[PDB]
Design a binder for this molecule. Structure first.
Ligand SMILES: Cc1cc2nc3c(=O)[nH]c(=O)nc-3n(C[C@H](O)[C@H](O)[C@H](O)COP(=O)(O)OP(=O)(O)OC[C@H]3O[C@@H](n4cnc5c(N)ncnc54)[C@H](O)[C@@H]3O)c2cc1C
Ligand SMILES: NC(=O)c1ccc[n+]([C@@H]2O[C@H](COP(=O)([O-])OP(=O)(O)OC[C@H]3O[C@@H](n4cnc5c(N)ncnc54)[C@H](OP(=O)(O)O)[C@@H]3O)[C@@H](O)[C@H]2O)c1
Length: 530
């Protein structure tokens, strides 16, 4: 890795690879540092069986390259992780991206030097790079989180986390296997494992809402047709709250009769996918509205499993539909109908400790040959906090953000000039199709950088007052929805001791992009440039 560079980029997943590509195109020196052996980010790390995207392949893809759009052939309604990894390798090879990337290398600290207006960045290999701009493309869901209980290191069997899955197939044949966590990771990994294991124990805490994916082959007519209008189709997706073609249902879940509700929701349930989140305009705004939808979903869940005792344990309760990430399930509910699959309800009987033989609840011991941790991620701030980042006056990012992330547009933080966060806290981030949130942040940041070199500036900084205004705005629009009142990773609720604040912008990607454009249009209002 070079000793000096215009822009250093941390992370080689979607965000990082695009930042590299566009920056070269703008004629800036740029280099990328990445912990992993190769490119991919989440689709490199998350190789557990059943790993699949929950945005339709034709939406969840880059649009910066008409060539890539014309050449790539997706195959399924929802792409499996290995296909998305092939796609990302395709794009990397096409634009020759690896010559710009150092792999196997973890950034450990970065400190801003006020005299030079530059960042000096250090790695666990002892490299030191001096860069004018520092782009953290280091992910949202990139640091695995272990669950909160002892005896983990004592377990005699094999121990896995889904976000750090082995690079070659793991064989569960004839095993007694435990999965802890039933987020989308656990929901995807579990039916795969149940095919091999002599017995599978699924350790559920709060149940998550899941609806049928109804995956299907992609019609190759449809692909070829779509391509003729691809750039147009994408543009429609950029002009939405969600970054996809999801239908924005006009009515209120409350204005309709029961019969019309069932019938409309029945159509979504048969169709499959996440679009039901926008069946009515107020599902995420009004608790009575939300509840009518949630109830319809709970009953479909009940009717999915024959033992009604086991079915009632699968019904999510205590939090509004859609306020933890919606999950797309494939034969997950069906799975509890098998002899060798066991739902362990750890709300009724909490896990007390892992033992050398298995798992202890307050009710009994569970002997196991392997334990799979589907326990999620220290989300949104996790990766940043693992790095000793220091701004003006030696302030640690970790400390300034200790009560929750403070940003302007989520893009930068006051006190830390020349530093940009891709698709993180204070922006749409994971509340969209992330390829659309990711391209828009990469273009805005890399445009900002180009504008800086153009007009002769060397220092970009969020104005503290606008940040404070932005933080309060994010919180106040979040408080008009039901989002903040549920314990989700959006809220930091899954890391012990982490401050409970809703971390994402909820006003929709479209409106967020309009605001960013007005900002850059006025020469970057809310930034101070010198
Ligand atoms: C299992 C899973 C499924 C998902 N499914 C969807 C989906 O269906 N729809 C959707 O819109 N989004 C989904 N997401 C969200 C996902 O975060 C984004 O879609 C997108 O892949 C994020 O890309 P990225 O480049 O920003 O971050 P990442 O892909 O996470 O890349 C960050 C990279 O930075 C590296 N890194 C972090 N810190 C350092 C450091 N200190 N030094 C060097 N390298 C570092 C990591 O190794 C990683 O490779 C999913 C995420 C996960 C984990
Ligand atoms: N496209 C996809 O289908 C897909 C697949 C995987 C991941 N993702 C992305 O990644 C996000 C995270 O998914 P995820 O399933 O990995 O993690 P998650 O949504 O954060 O779920 C973690 C799970 O582990 C359980 N858990 C956590 N801590 C525990 C503890 N201390 N004791 C007992 N149980 C514990 C949680 O229970 P509680 O809920 O009760 O806390 C939850 O069931 C998703 O929401 C999505 O954004 C997407």
């Amino acid at each position: 890795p070079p000793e000096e560079v215009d822009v250093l980029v941390v992370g080689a997943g979607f965000s990082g690879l695009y930042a590299l590509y566009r920056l070269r195109e703008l004629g800036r020196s740029v280099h990328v540092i990445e912990t992993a052996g190769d490119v991919g980010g989440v689709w490199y790390w998350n190789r557990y069986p059943g790993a699949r995207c929950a945005i339709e392949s034709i939406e969840y893809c880059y649009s910066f390259s008409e060539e890539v759009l014309q050449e790539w052939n997706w195959t399924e309604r929802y792409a499996s992780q290995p296909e998305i990894l092939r796609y990302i390798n395709f794009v990397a090879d096409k634009f020759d991206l690896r010559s710009g990337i150092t792999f196997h290398t973890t950034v450990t600290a970065a400190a801003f030097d006020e005299a030079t207006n530059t960042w000096t960045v250090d790695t666990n290999h002892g490299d030191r790079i001096r860069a004018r701009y520092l782009i953290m493309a280091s992910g949202q869901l990139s640091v695995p989180q272990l669950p909160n209980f002892p005896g983990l290191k004592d377990f005699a069997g094999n121990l896995y986390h889904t976000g750090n899955w082995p690079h070659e197939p793991v064989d569960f044949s004839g095993q007694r296997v435990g999965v802890i966590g039933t987020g989308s990771s656990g929901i995807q990994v579990s039916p795969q494992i149940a095919k091999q294991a002599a017995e599978l124990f699924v350790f559920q805490r709060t149940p998550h809402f899941a609806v049928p994916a109804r995956n299907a082959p992609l019609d190759p007519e449809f692909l070829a047709d779509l391509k003729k209008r691809y750039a147009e189709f994408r543009e429609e997706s950029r002009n939405t709250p969600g970054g996809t073609h999801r239908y924005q249902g006009p009515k209120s879940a409350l204005e309709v009769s029961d019969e019309e509700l069932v019938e409309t929701l029945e159509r979504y349930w048969q169709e499959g996918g996440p679009d039901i989140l926008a069946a009515y305009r107020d599902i995420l705004r009004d608790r009575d509205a939300n509840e009518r939808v949630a109830e319809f979903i709970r009953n479909k869940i009940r009717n999915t499993v024959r033992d009604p005792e086991v079915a009632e344990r699968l019904v999510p309760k205590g939090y509004p539909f859609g306020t933890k990430r919606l999950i797309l399930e494939i034969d997950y509910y069906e799975m509890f109908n098998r002899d060798n699959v066991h739902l362990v309800d750890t709300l009724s009987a909490p896990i007390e400790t892992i033992t050398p033989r298995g798992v202890r609840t307050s009710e009994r011991e569970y002997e196991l040959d392997s334990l799979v941790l589907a326990t999620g991620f220290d989300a949104l701030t996790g990766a940043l906090f693992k790095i000793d980042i220091r701004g003006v006056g030696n302030v640690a990012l970790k400390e300034k953000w200790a009560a929750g992330p403070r940003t302007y547009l989520g893009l930068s933080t006051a006190g830390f000039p020349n530093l940009f966060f891709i698709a993180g806290p204070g922006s749409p981030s994971a509340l969209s199709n992330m390829l659309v949130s990711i391209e828009q942040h990469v273009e805005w940041v890399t445009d900002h950088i180009a504008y800086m070199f153009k007009n002769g500036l060397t220092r970009s900084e969020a104005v503290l007052e606008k940040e404070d205004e932005w933080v309060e705005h994010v919180n106040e629009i979040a408080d008009e929805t039901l989002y903040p009142m549920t314990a989700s990773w959006y809220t930091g609720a899954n890391v012990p001791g982490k401050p409970r604040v809703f971390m994402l912008y909820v006003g929709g990607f479209h409106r967020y992009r309009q605001i960013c454009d007005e900002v850059a249009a006025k020469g970057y209002e809310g930034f101070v440039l010198t």
